[PDB]
Design a protein around this ligand. Structure first.
Ligand SMILES: [Cl-]
Ligand SMILES: [Cl-]
Ligand SMILES: [Cl-]
Length: 130
């Protein structure tokens, strides 16, 4: 599914993302916007390294989920990458929380550094009741 902005914001808040390991909801919104356009079914193959990015946060198969087809990969979220292509984003959120338990935190996603870091991101949550 493709979430509407405010629907997603409330969805993430219910799932405990607001301020998780220091990360405001608006930072998670900005991440989702630029990774996927709020689209849970998005996949992107990285021909360079044979990995794939899955779902609303575009979580990578090399480290985070298992797709069977990525050489040398591990699965720190202990999920099938399929779980990151559900309309229900609970598993994706659990996996995003796992990512940011690692030292880089949200810096793990380059798109965040590019499109969100050091920016005014207040617009993402404006009006949403969150
Ligand atoms: Cl911030
Ligand atoms: Cl699974
Ligand atoms: Cl679903």
């Amino acid at each position: 599914k493709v979430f509407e902005r405010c629907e997603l914001a409330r969805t993430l808040k219910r799932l405990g993302m607001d301020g998780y390991r220091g990360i405001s909801l608006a930072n998670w919104m900005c991440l989702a916007k630029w990774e996927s356009g709020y689209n849970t079914r998005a996949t992107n193959y990285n021909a360079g390294d044979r990995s794939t990015d899955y779902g609303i946060f575009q979580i990578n198969s090399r480290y985070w989920c298992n797709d069977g087809k990525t050489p040398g990969a591990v699965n720190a979220c202990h999920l099938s990458c399929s779980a990151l292509l559900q309309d229900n984003i609970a598993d994706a959120v659990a996996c995003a929380k796992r990512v940011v338990r690692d030292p880089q935190g949200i810096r793990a996603w380059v798109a965040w550094r590019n499109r969100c870091q050091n920016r005014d991101v207040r617009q993402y949550v404006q009006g949403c009741g969150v």
